[PDB]
């Protein structure tokens, strides 16, 4: 039952990283399209990434939720590892952010809610993403979210500069509140069109993060602003959603989510992005 590279018609490259390439592939026997993550074993071994790639596969195996990528199969030849993943026809969220400039209130609320429910599921399994951002949040043919990129994910017993939490720059310590921080950055970015902390280089961005140096544009939705101010908290113990703040209940009960039906989000028809 183990699939082979010969079982597929490989097509365009969807994405490229340091340790992997993601390529569109049509399975010949079924006509099914998969997004196959291809990883060179030699490069992984040379850079000591074996624990990372092992963990990534193990994390993805545990995922059984509509707002996350699914791992359908794995195989390998002499050179390469192949992970068969969900194909998300509409690509990254970042692409839509840049195309329409910024989301209105309805689209912000709906897509924020989908990320919240996804994180609720993820954190309830004791798994932490650690690199949450619009580039890693895909959209399927129905325009529902599909979170991907589990290469730096952590299972409990630095990600991208702009979405890095203060505690990560202090104690070098990562937990659930790091994801919730990144959530606050994403909400801001959906409403404003750009992430909250921006500077000339990485050092200057890190400076702004630890000082909490960011401004809301005047037109920012008041209830969205109020939510962002409760996620972008320097003390990781005081952020909405975290265990010390009594979890996801209070987060979901925030006035910004007033009209949200949380129980069936993935079967609701997504609002048009205009
Ligand atoms: C039509 O457009 C697209 C459709 C797609 N469908 C399914 C996907 C899937 N299951 N996983 C990934 C994915 C898997 N590992 C890591 C990832 O990191 C994204 C970035 N940090 C940079 C990057 C890319 C590739 C490898 C490593 C890092 C992404 C991407 C896609 C995907 C991407 C598409 O366009 C970009």
From Swiss-Prot:
Binding positions (ATP): 18-20, 37, 86-88, 92, 135, 149
Modified residues (N6-acetyllysine): 219
Effect listed in the UniProt record for changing residue 269 to A: Abolishes phosphorylation by MELK
Region (PIF-pocket): 39-83
Cell location: Cytoplasm; Nucleus; Cell membrane; Cell junction, Focal adhesion
Active-site residues per Swiss-Prot or TrEMBL entry: 131
Disulfide-bonded cysteines: none
Stated induction or repression of this protein's expression: Stimulated by insulin, and the oxidants hydrogen peroxide and peroxovanadate.
Modification comment: Autophosphorylation is inhibited by the apoptotic C-terminus cleavage product of PKN2. Angiotensin II stimulates the tyrosine phosphorylation of PDPK1 in vascular smooth muscle in a calcium- and SRC-dependent manner. Autophosphorylated; autophosphorylation is inhibited by the apoptotic C-terminus cleavage product of PKN2.
Modified sites of kind Phosphothreonine: 269
Tissue: Appears to be expressed ubiquitously.
Residue stretches making up the Protein kinase domain: 8-257
Impact upon substituting residue 192 to V: 3-fold increase in kinase activity
Domain of life: Eukaryota
Quaternary organization: Homodimer in its autoinhibited state. Active as monomer. Interacts with NPRL2, PPARG, PAK1, PTK2B, GRB14, PKN1 (via C-terminus), STRAP and IKKB. Interacts with SGK3 in a phosphorylation-dependent manner. The tyrosine-phosphorylated form interacts with PTPN6. Binds INSR in response to insulin. Interacts (via PH domain) with SMAD3, SMAD4 and SMAD7.
Domain comment as written in the entry: The PH domain plays a pivotal role in the localization and nuclear import of PDPK1 and is also essential for its homodimerization. The PIF-pocket is a small lobe in the catalytic domain required by the enzyme for the binding to the hydrophobic motif of its substrates. It is an allosteric regulatory site that can accommodate small compounds acting as allosteric inhibitors.
Role played: Serine/threonine kinase which acts as a master kinase, phosphorylating and activating a subgroup of the AGC family of protein kinases. Its targets include: protein kinase B (PKB/AKT1, PKB/AKT2, PKB/AKT3), p70 ribosomal protein S6 kinase (RPS6KB1), p90 ribosomal protein S6 kinase (RPS6KA1, RPS6KA2 and RPS6KA3), cyclic AMP-dependent protein kinase (PRKACA), protein kinase C (PRKCD and PRKCZ), serum and glucocorticoid-inducible kinase (SGK1, SGK2 and SGK3), p21-activated kinase-1 (PAK1), TSSK3, protein kinase PKN (PKN1 and PKN2).
Recorded family membership: Belongs to the protein kinase superfamily. AGC Ser/Thr protein kinase family. PDPK1 subfamily.
Protein name as it appears in the record: 3-phosphoinositide-dependent protein kinase 1
Natural source organism: Homo sapiens
Residues of the full protein shown: 75 to 359 of 556
């Amino acid at each position: 039952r183990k699939k082979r590279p010969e079982d597929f018609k490989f097509g365009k490259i969807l994405g490229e990283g340091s340790f992997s390439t993601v390529v569109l592939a049509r399975e010949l026997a079924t006509s099914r399209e998969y997004a196959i993550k291809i990883l060179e074993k030699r490069h992984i071994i040379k850079e000591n990434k074996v624990p990372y790639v092992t963990r990534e596969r193990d994390v993805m195996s545990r995922l059984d939720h509509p707002f996350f990528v699914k791992l359908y199969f794995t195989f390998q030849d002499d050179e390469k590892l192949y992970f068969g993943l969900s194909y998300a026809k509409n690509g990254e969220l970042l692409k839509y952010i840049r195309k329409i400039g910024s989301f209105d209130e309805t689209c912000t609320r709906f897509y924020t809610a989908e990320i919240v429910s996804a994180l609720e599921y993820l954190h309830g399994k004791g798994i932490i993403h650690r690199d949450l951002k619009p580039e890693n949040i895909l959209l399927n043919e129905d325009m529902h979210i599909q979170i991907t990129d589990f290469g730096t994910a952590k299972v409990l017993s630095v990600g991208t500069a702009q979405y890095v939490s203060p505690e990560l720059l202090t104690e070098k310590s990562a937990c659930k509140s790091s994801d919730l921080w990144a959530l606050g950055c994403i909400i801001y970015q959906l409403v404003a069109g750009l992430p909250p902390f921006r500077a000339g280089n990485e050092y200057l961005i890190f400076q702004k993060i630890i000082k909490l140096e960011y401004d809301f544009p005047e037109k920012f939705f008041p209830k969205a602003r109020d939510l962002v101010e409760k996620l972008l908290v320097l003390d990781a113990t005081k952020r909405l959603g975290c265990e010390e703040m009594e979890g996801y209940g209070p987060l979901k009960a925030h006035p910004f989510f007033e009209s949200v039906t949380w129980e069936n989000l993935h079967q609701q028809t997504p609002p048009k992005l205009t």
